[PDB]
């Protein structure tokens, strides 16, 4: 390796990220004054639990679809065997979304951009999972305090996804090599932009714990509403989480 080759990886990951975002950062910034009214909030709160679940799982699934496209443009990803591509996406895609959502989060009033306006965590009360919701919102507040650039999110999310410790990987060496090259590229970029102080502040088990809390909450919902899950949750969502 050499610096040019590492810096090429950085630019390639940032571009892949840019083309697979879904919502552009400037779009999200320009809507920050567009906040749900007390009555719109109340409207969300009065929705049935099963309806709120279906809507949320829909938007999450759409988000995950963009993560898949990001993966497919990640240098090295498509050269892994398909078994390993799937392992990495099953364990990683939700973690990616949870990192990517800090872009849509306004830490000044603790709201998130959801179905066209910003709203507070109380918007999601009808879900019945205040503890998970609260921890997601805190997680995003933590990440917002770092002031991630778009390049930092790109590189960090690549590393969330390319993790050679995922159980089930058939060629764990090949993934380790990819991961180490991505780690070098991220750290290189931080060293060049005088941002190495963030290394210390990145989250620890934390991403894992949020994804676990998601899955245990789903098993409770599907036990109480199994036909709703069968008939009205997206196929992709069930494939990743059920």
């Amino acid at each position: 390796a050499s610096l040019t080759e590492i810096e090429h990886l950085v630019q390639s990951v940032c571009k892949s990220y840019r083309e697979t975002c879904q919502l552009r950062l400037e779009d999200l910034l320009r809507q920050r004054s567009n906040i749900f009214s007390r009555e719109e909030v109340t409207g969300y709160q009065r929705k049935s639990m099963w309806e709120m679940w279906e809507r949320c799982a829909h938007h999450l699934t759409e988000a995950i679809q963009y993560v898949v496209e990001f993966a497919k443009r990640l240098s090295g990803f498509m050269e892994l065997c398909q078994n390993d591509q799937i392992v990495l996406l099953k364990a990683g895609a939700m973690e990616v979304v949870l990192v990517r959502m800090c872009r849509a989060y306004n830490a000044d009033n603790r709201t998130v951009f959801f179905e066209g306006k910003y709203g507070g965590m109380e918007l999601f009360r009808a879900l019945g999972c205040s503890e998970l919701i609260s921890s997601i919102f805190d997680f995003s507040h933590s990440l917002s305090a770092l002031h991630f650039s778009e390049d930092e999110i790109a590189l960090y999310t690549a590393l969330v996804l390319i993790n050679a410790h995922r159980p089930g990987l058939q060629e764990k060496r090949k993934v380790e090599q990819l991961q180490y090259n991505l780690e070098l590229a991220f750290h290189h970029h931080l060293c060049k932009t005088h941002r190495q102080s963030i290394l210390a502040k990145l989250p620890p088990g934390k991403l894992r714990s949020l994804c676990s809390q998601h899955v245990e909450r789903l098993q409770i919902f599907q036990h109480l509403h199994p036909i709703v899950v069968q008939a009205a949750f997206p196929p992709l969502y069930k494939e990743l989480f059920s």
Partner: peptide
């Protein structure tokens, strides 16, 4: 399976 298709297409 959906994943298979998204990865192939």
């Amino acid at each position: 399976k959906i994943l298979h298709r998204l990865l192939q297409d």
